[PDB]
Design brief:
Length: 120
C-alpha cells in the first residue's frame, strides 16, 4: 500500500514536472483514455483530448506550475498548486486545487480543478 501510494505520488511529480517542461507526451501517457476533467468553478466537463488541447494552449502562454502540498485521501489525491501564465505580456497568477482520482499501472481517471486567479 505504501508502494501504491509512493507510485501515485511519483506520477504526480512527473505530471507537474512534465508541465513545466512542456512535455505533453508525458502527460498523455498518465491519463486513461476515458478520463473526465472537471472545471469546478464553471461546471465544465472535458474528455482527455479536449483537456489536452487546453493544456496545449496554456503551455503556449508559458504556463508554469509549482506544487505546494499533496494529500492522499481507487486513490484520491488533493494537490494544491501555484501557477502562472503570461497572456499578451501580462502575467496572471493562480492558486489551483487539483483533486485526482487514480484507478489501476495507475492512471488518472478523473480530475476536478478549482482555479482561483490571485492577481499578479
Ligand atoms: C490553464 C488553466 C485553465 C484555464 C484557466 O482559466 C486558468 C488556467 C491556469 C492554471 C491551469 C489551468 C488548466 O490548464 C489546469 C492546470 C494545468 C492549471 C494549473 C495546474 C492545472 O490544474 C493542472 O495541472 C491539471 O492537471
Amino acid at each position: 500500500s505504501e508502494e501504491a501510494k509512493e507510485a501515485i505520488i511519483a506520477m504526480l511529480k512527473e505530471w507537474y514536472d512534465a508541465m513545466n517542461e512542456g512535455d505533453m507526451e508525458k502527460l498523455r501517457s498518465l491519463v486513461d483514455p476515458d478520463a473526465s476533467f472537471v472545471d469546478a468553478r464553471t461546471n465544465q466537463v472535458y474528455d482527455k483530448d479536449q483537456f489536452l488541447q487546453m493544456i496545449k494552449e496554456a503551455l503556449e502562454q508559458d504556463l508554469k506550475v509549482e506544487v505546494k502540498s499533496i494529500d492522499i485521501e481507487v486513490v484520491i489525491v488533493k494537490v494544491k498548486v501555484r501557477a502562472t501564465m503570461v497572456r499578451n505580456g501580462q502575467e496572471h497568477v493562480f492558486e489551483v486545487v487539483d483533486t485526482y482520482e487514480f484507478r489501476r499501472s495507475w492512471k488518472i481517471v478523473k480530475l476536478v480543478s478549482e482555479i482561483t486567479q490571485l492577481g499578479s
